[PDB]
Symmetry: C2
Subunit: 277 residues, 2 copies
C-alpha cells in the first residue's frame, strides 16, 4: 500500500512481524508443515521459495524436545534422513548428541509435491537466544524477514525484543543522519556470518544490498514502526511523500535524523540483550 500505513502499525500486538504470503502460496507451505506428524511448535518459512518474485523451500521447525521429535520423525519419514556410516573407527553420535543441540537439517526432501529443506531446533534454545543473544546465531535469522507459518502469536511475542534490539544496534552504529537503506544493510550485516555458520542456506551467500533491495517492503514493515516509536529519531520526508510511497519501491529511500548524545547512546547500549542484568 503506502509507507504511511506502515507507520500506523500496532507494535503492542506485533503487527510489524505479521508477514504472511498470498493465500495460495500460504496454503502450499501450510500443507507442507502439516504433513509432519511430529509436533512442531513454531514453523518458519524463509528464502527464495517463500519470498518469490521449482526452487527448494527452506523451513525451520522449532520443537519442544528435538530428540523425541526426531524419534517420531524417523518412524514416519525414515527416508528423509541420511546418516554417515562407520567407515574406519568411530565418530559415533547418540540421539542427544546429534539431535539435541544446534540445527539439524534434512535436505532435498520431497513433501507434498515440493522439494524442501528443513532444519529442526529446540524452541527453548531459540527463545533463550531471542532474549539474551547467547550467540545470536538463531536470533539473527529473525532480525530479517521470515514467515511464521505456525505458532505465530507465541513467536512474535518472544521476538519483538530481538527486533527492537537489532534496530538499537543499528542506531548505535549509524551517524546522526542516515537513510533506511543504510539501516537495513547495517542490520543484515549483524547476522551475515551467523547465517553462514548455521548453514541456513545451501546456496551461496548474497550481496547485502541485494538482500535489502529484494526484501525492501518487508524491512520497511518490520522496522519503520520501530523507527517511528524511537524517541529522538526524526523522519525527514513529509507526510506527503510517505503517503505517496509504495513500500515495494526501491527508487527512493527515507532519510532520518537521530539524537546521538552521550546519554542517548548509553541508553541504547544498556538496553541490549548483551547488557541485561
Amino acid at each position: 500500500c503506502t509507507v504511511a500505513q506502515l507507520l500506523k502499525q500496532n507494535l503492542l500486538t506485533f503487527e510489524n512481524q505479521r508477514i504472511q504470503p498470498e493465500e495460495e502460496l500460504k496454503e502450499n507451505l501450510t500443507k507442507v508443515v502439516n504433513y509432519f506428524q511430529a509436533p512442531i511448535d513454531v514453523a518458519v518459512g524463509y528464502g527464495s521459495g517463500v519470498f518469490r518474485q521449482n526452487p527448494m523451500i527452506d523451513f525451520i521447525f522449532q520443537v519442544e524436545d528435538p530428540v523425541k521429535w526426531h524419534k517420531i520423525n524417523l518412524q514416519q519419514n525414515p527416508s528423509h534422513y541420511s546418516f554417515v556410516k562407520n567407515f574406519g573407527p568411530g565418530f559415533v553420535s547418540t540421539l542427544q548428541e546429534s539431535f539435541g543441540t544446534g540445527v539439524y537439517y534434512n535436505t532435498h526432501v520431497e513433501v507434498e509435491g515440493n522439494i524442501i529443506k528443513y532444519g529442526v531446533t529446540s524452541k527453548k534454545d531459540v527463545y533463550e537466544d531471542l532474549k539474551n543473544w547467547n550467540t545470536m546465531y538463531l536470533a539473527g535469522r529473525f532480525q530479517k524477514p521470515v514467515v511464521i507459518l505456525k505458532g505465530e502469536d507465541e513467536f512474535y511475542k518472544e521476538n519483538s525484543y530481538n527486533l527492537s534490539s537489532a534496530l538499537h544496534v543499528g542506531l548505535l552504529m549509524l551517524a546522526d543522519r542516515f537513510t533506511e537503506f543504510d539501516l537495513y544493510k547495517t542490520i543484515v550485516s549483524l547476522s551475515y556470518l551467523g547465517d553462514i555458520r548455521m548453514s541456513f542456506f545451501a546456496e551461496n551467500p548474497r550481496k547485502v544490498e541485494n538482500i535489502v533491495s529484494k526484501q525492501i517492503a518487508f524491512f520497511r514493515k518490520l522496522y519503520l514502526p520501530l523507527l517511528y516509536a524511537e524517541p529522538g529519531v526524526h523522519f525527514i520526508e513529509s507526510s506527503e511523500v510517505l503517503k505517496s510511497m509504495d513500500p515495494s519501491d526501491n527508487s527512493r529511500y527515507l532519510s532520518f535524523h537521530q539524537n546521538i548524545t552521550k546519554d542517548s547512546i548509553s541508553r541504547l547500549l544498556n538496553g541490549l540483550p548483551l547488557n541485561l542484568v
Copy 2:
C-alpha cells in the same frame, strides 16, 4: 609516505600489520607492559589511549596460562582486583574469555588490561570459533610484545575479514564501504567482550579516524586479491596521503558464482 607506498608492502613479513606508535608513546606503553612480573607472551595496545588524535590506556595480555598468571599477579598487585565485596568462582572466570582489571594506576598511567589465554586467541584467529577475539584484531591494534609470533597467526584472520567484505559487497564498492563493512562484522563482539569501557562509537567515525591504518592493513591485501582491482590510476595513488578522508579509492571485483564460492570455501568457518 603515500597510498602507493602502502601497496608495495611485504605481506610475507606482515608489514601491513606492523603498526607502531611514535617512539614517545611506545616507551611508556612498554614500561607499562614490563611492570608486570607475571609473564606476558603477547601484549596489545588499542583504544584512544594508544591511537592519539591522560585517558585510560587499554591493553590485552595474552598469556600461556591465565590461572597461573593471575596467581602471580594477585601477589604483585592485589589492589588491582575489586573482588573484596565477596576464590573458586573468580578462578573459573580467569579461565575463559577476557578478565579485566580497570582504572588501575601503573607507571604514571591509569590503565585497563584484559587477560586471556594465548591459545584461545590463536585458535580463534584460525578457526573463528566465536570470532570474539579475532574480531578485535581485524582492526588497527598496536602489538607491543610478541609481534612476529602474533602477526603470523593474524594474517589469515585479516585476509578472511577482507573475503567476508568481498562476499557482502557488490561488484563496485569504495574502500569506505569496505572498512565500514569489516567494522560491522566485529561491532557486537567488541561490545560482548567489553573491550572498551566507553560507549561504542559510530562505524563511520571509527573508520575515518583510523583511515590510515585500515589502509595500511587492507590495501595490500586488496592488491594481492585475484579478481579485485583498483579503479584509480597510478598517479592518483601517488597523490594521496593515507590520512586523507576527503577522497576514497574505488574497486571492481569479479562477482561470478565460482568467485563467490571460492571466497566462501576459504573462510575460517569451514571445518575442512
